[PDB]
Amino acid sequence: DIERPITTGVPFLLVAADARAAGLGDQGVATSSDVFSQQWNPAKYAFAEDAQGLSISYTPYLTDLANDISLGQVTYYNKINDRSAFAGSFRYFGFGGIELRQTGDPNEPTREVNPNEFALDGSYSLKLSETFSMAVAARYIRSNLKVATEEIDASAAGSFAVDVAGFYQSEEIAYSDFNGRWRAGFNIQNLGPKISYDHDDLSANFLPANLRVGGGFDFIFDDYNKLGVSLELTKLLVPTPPGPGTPSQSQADEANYKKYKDIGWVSGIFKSFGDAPGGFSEELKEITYSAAAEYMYQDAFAMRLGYYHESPMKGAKQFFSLGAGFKYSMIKVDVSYLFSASKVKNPLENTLRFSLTFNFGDKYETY
């Protein structure tokens, strides 16, 4: 099963937060530009068709067990020129309100705790050429999951991170049977200082520094039927912890952990490439991939199919995803569902994701 997973702080940052990308196998780095294109590739906000947009996303957790445990996302973008765009997003994971009750009469004033985790990020995307765009994003992450007790301090832990992303979208290219369009993108995510959950420099966790690379092709037939095929590759930019031993018996393990944990995040980013006994063939074992297909009808109905594969030695998250999208006038609705293919219970099994986006403002022509 899962041998030597990468341990990072705030792992909620890597969860797909919108139904459209979830339905496409948790990938968005090289799909078409959309309102949710901040977690995946902020650089394609410069390629948006509408001037500005707002989105609400709901990803419930443990739906059979409890309500109000969910990951919510609000995104707003505003492309001002034909070349630039501003975007701000807010991802929020919370357990809902929990009342701290110790009986002591059924009218006692009870404290209510709301353990939660959120990331607030803003990005600016600029079109360098007519087909290429870049973006920089700044993110504030705050983790507040623990509940205050005696001898447990529930002070929130925070960190800052930056993202550098690029998006390529070619013009329409006519072929023998169709006039297709190519897409590519990269996103280096969550680059920032380590997050200290216990507010001590000796005990700090790497931010989930992530590299997403992907490409996409759009099969366009009959000028109103689209088949979008996209591929994505993802690698964590965090050093892998030591395993059996690489210098008594436990002394080697403790020394290896000590040398692993005394690694800077900047140096850890470069040490992610390697730091394992295996070669390049076994280095590819740290790469996750996802393949997706999206059929578009009139640009108002979409059907999404996606496969996500994490190498079962790490994480072991393998699933198929189905998604559908509907656009009424200015409102888009997206739902997605996950079919797990791994031994380990996926927390998002048997869960329907829901996304809702509003598009308003002027309309920009696509090149």
């Binding site: 002591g104 009469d105 006692e108 004033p109 404290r111 509003f358």
Partner: protein
């Protein structure tokens, strides 16, 4: 360019409770229970459109300790709730 009425609703409450146990034959009035809660709930409506409504809310609650087994508790909830109709 956008005109709407602002509906203000404010609700204040102050509740005092006291349980006393009194001895008849000597001065032994025992404070056995108590509660000294006050709460304030403010709300403010604004219809930005026929479908879009913005509400500001401010809930402030303070419970004072009457006997030492209870701790003073302040609960403040304030923010904006955006509501859209289809």
């Amino acid at each position: 360019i956008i005109k709407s009425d602002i509906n203000i609703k404010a609700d204040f409450s102050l509740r005092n409770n006291e349980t006393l146990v009194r001895y008849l034959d000597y001065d032994n009035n025992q404070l056995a229970a108590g509660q000294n809660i006050w709460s304030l709930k403010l709300t403010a409506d604004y219809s930005f459109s026929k479908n879009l409504t913005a509400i500001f809310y401010y809930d402030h609650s303070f419970s004072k300790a009457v006997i030492s087994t209870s701790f003073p508790l302040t609960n403040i909830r304030s923010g904006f709730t955006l509501r859209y109709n289809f």
